[PDB]
Design an enzyme around this catalytic site. Structure first.
Site, PDB file in Angstrom:
ATOM      1  N   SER A  91       0.836  -1.202   0.000  1.00 19.39           N
ATOM      2  CA  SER A  91       0.000   0.000   0.000  1.00 19.39           C
ATOM      3  C   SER A  91       0.874   1.257   0.000  1.00 19.39           C
ATOM      4  O   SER A  91       1.543   1.536  -0.992  1.00 19.39           O
ATOM      5  CB  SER A  91      -0.942  -0.016   1.213  1.00 19.39           C
ATOM      6  OG  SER A  91      -2.067   0.828   1.005  1.00 19.39           O
ATOM      7  N   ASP A  98     -10.432  -5.224  -3.450  1.00 19.69           N
ATOM      8  CA  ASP A  98      -9.767  -4.339  -2.492  1.00 19.69           C
ATOM      9  C   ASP A  98     -10.746  -3.210  -2.150  1.00 19.69           C
ATOM     10  O   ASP A  98     -11.133  -2.439  -3.020  1.00 19.69           O
ATOM     11  CB  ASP A  98      -8.503  -3.754  -3.120  1.00 19.69           C
ATOM     12  CG  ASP A  98      -7.622  -3.053  -2.109  1.00 19.69           C
ATOM     13  OD1 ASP A  98      -8.161  -2.325  -1.250  1.00 19.69           O
ATOM     14  OD2 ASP A  98      -6.387  -3.224  -2.178  1.00 19.69           O
ATOM     15  N   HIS A 144      -7.281  -5.971   0.597  1.00 13.27           N
ATOM     16  CA  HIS A 144      -6.118  -5.091   0.646  1.00 13.27           C
ATOM     17  C   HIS A 144      -4.917  -5.850   1.225  1.00 13.27           C
ATOM     18  O   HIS A 144      -3.975  -5.245   1.731  1.00 13.27           O
ATOM     19  CB  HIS A 144      -6.464  -3.866   1.513  1.00 13.27           C
ATOM     20  CG  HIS A 144      -5.567  -2.679   1.307  1.00 13.27           C
ATOM     21  ND1 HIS A 144      -5.351  -2.113   0.073  1.00 13.27           N
ATOM     22  CD2 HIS A 144      -4.895  -1.914   2.200  1.00 13.27           C
ATOM     23  CE1 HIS A 144      -4.581  -1.041   0.211  1.00 13.27           C
ATOM     24  NE2 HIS A 144      -4.294  -0.900   1.489  1.00 13.27           N
TER      25      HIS A 144
END
Length: 192
Positions: free
Chosen positions: A73, A136, A163
């Site tokens: 991320s 996600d 995620h």
């Protein structure tokens, strides 16, 4: 020849060694004879400022031409910007994207204030692998696809990993081990 892997986590106060899959992956990678895996809590963990994370990656995580950077991320975003000015052996992007998602904390990081220098990244990093899931809840697939298309990543596309916030990640280990064998390079396209 990669000498180590370095994990750059997503933003958040969670301790890297016990949050998400970072710890399990670190332990699995440390099972590899003669290999190392660094994972440290990041300075400014909440906003993940580029001006803070990149220097840390350089001097405290020692990210160099013999490093496989695993970015998750915000960490994937950081790895991408890092690669615009640093040569790296490989970058494994987990849940990568391209804009601030209209989010104030994302904008505050400074990572999205200008276009992505895709060609520089592609030139500075020979191997770019990417993990992304269509379900996600944080990211629009369009942006994960943009990264895949612009960086010509070796995409590992899933439909139910969200995620990537679970505690184990076997497929990631397989990827790192394949990178240690230094696979044959694929035909890509480099432009000015």
């Amino acid at each position: 020849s990669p000498s180590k892997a370095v994990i750059v986590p997503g933003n958040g106060g969670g301790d890297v060694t016990t949050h998400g899959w970072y710890g399990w992956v670190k332990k699995e990678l440390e099972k590899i004879p003669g290999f190392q895996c660094l994972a440290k809590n990041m300075p400014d963990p909440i906003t993940a400022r580029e001006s803070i994370w990149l220097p840390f990656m350089e001097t405290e995580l020692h990210c160099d031409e013999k490093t496989i950077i695993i970015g998750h991320s915000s960490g994937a975003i950081a790895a991408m910007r890092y690669a615009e000015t640093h040569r790296v052996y490989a970058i494994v992007l987990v849940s990568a994207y391209t804009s601030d998602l209209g989010d104030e904390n994302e904008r505050a990081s400074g990572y999205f204030t200008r276009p992505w220098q895709w060609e520089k990244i592609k030139a500075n990093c020979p191997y770019i692998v990417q993990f992304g899931s269509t379900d996600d809840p944080f990211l629009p697939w369009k942006e994960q696809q943009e990264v895949a298309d612009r960086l010509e990543t070796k995409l590992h596309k899933f439909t139910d990993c969200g995620h990537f916030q679970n505690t184990e990640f076997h497929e990631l280990i397989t990827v790192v081990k394949s990178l240690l064998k230094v696979p044959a390079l694929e035909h890509h396209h480099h432009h000015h």
